[PDB]
C-alpha cells in the first residue's frame, strides 16, 4: 500500500494480530495448504515444472469452489469445481451447488 502511508498492520511488535499475519481464512486448512503450496510451489512450479494443481479456498479457509491442475505452457488447467471439502465434483448437484461454486452444475 503506497497511495497513503497510513498502514499499521505489521510494524515490529510480537502481538496476536502481528502473529496472525499468516493470511489465514475463517478457520480453514485449505488456506494454510494454499499459502504453503502457492508461496513455495507456485514460484518453482507453474512456470517450468509440469502441470501442478493448486487448491482453492473460500474466505472460510476450506476448499470451497476450485481445485485445478496448472499447465506450465498453456493457460489451460484444466480447472474443475469441488465441494467445500475440496472433492472434485464431476457433475453432482449435491456437491456442485452455490455452497461450493456459484453456477455451473452441468450434471
Swiss-Prot record:
Positions of the Thyroglobulin type-1 domain:
28-101
Quick one: where is this thing mainly located? Answer: secreted
Q: Name the segments for region: Disordered.
A: 84-107
Q: Is the keyword Disulfide bond in the record?
A: yes
Please give the subunit comment from the record: Interacts (via C-terminal domain) with PHB2.
Annotated gene: IGFBP6
- Alphabetized GO MF terms: fibronectin binding; identical protein binding; insulin-like growth factor I binding; insulin-like growth factor II binding; signaling receptor binding
Q: Which GO biological process categories is it annotated with?
A: cell migration; negative regulation of canonical Wnt signaling pathway; negative regulation of cell population proliferation; positive regulation of MAPK cascade; positive regulation of stress-activated MAPK cascade; regulation of insulin-like growth factor receptor signaling pathway; signal transduction
Biased segments, Polar residues type: 95-107
Name the source organism. Homo sapiens (Human)
List locations, semicolon-separated: Secreted
Q: Which residues of the full protein are shown?
A: 161 to 240 of 240
Name the cystine pairs. Answer: 30-57, 68-79, 81-101
User: What protein name is recorded for this chain?
Assistant: Insulin-like growth factor-binding protein 6
| Keywords, comma-separated and alphabetical | Disulfide bond, Glycoprotein, Growth factor binding, Secreted, Signal
Identify the domain of life: Eukaryota
Q: Which GO terms describe its cellular component?
A: extracellular region; extracellular space; insulin-like growth factor binary complex
Q: What does this protein do?
A: IGF-binding proteins prolong the half-life of the IGFs and have been shown to either inhibit or stimulate the growth promoting effects of the IGFs on cell culture. They alter the interaction of IGFs with their cell surface receptors. Activates the MAPK signaling pathway and induces cell migration.
State the post-translational modifications: O-linked glycans consist of hexose (probably Gal), N-acetylhexosamine (probably GalNAc) and sialic acid residues. O-glycosylated with core 1 or possibly core 8 glycans. O-glycosylated on one site only in the region AA 143-168 in cerebrospinal fluid.
Amino acid at each position: 500500500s503506497y497511495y497513503h502511508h497510513h498502514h499499521h498492520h505489521d510494524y515490529d511488535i510480537p502481538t496476536t494480530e502481528n502473529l496472525y499475519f499468516q493470511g489465514a481464512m475463517g478457520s480453514g486448512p485449505c488456506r494454510r495448504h494454499l499459502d504453503s503450496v502457492l508461496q513455495q510451489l507456485q514460484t518453482e512450479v507453474y512456470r517450468g515444472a509440469q502441470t501442478l494443481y493448486v487448491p482453492n479456498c473460500d474466505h472460510r479457509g476450506f476448499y470451497r469452489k476450485r481445485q485445478c491442475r496448472s499447465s506450465q505452457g498453456q493457460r489451460r488447467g484444466p480447472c474443475w469445481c469441488v465441494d467445500r471439502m475440496g472433492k472434485s465434483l464431476p457433475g453432482s448437484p449435491d456437491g456442485n451447488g452455490s455452497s461450493s461454486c456459484p453456477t455451473g452444475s452441468s450434471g
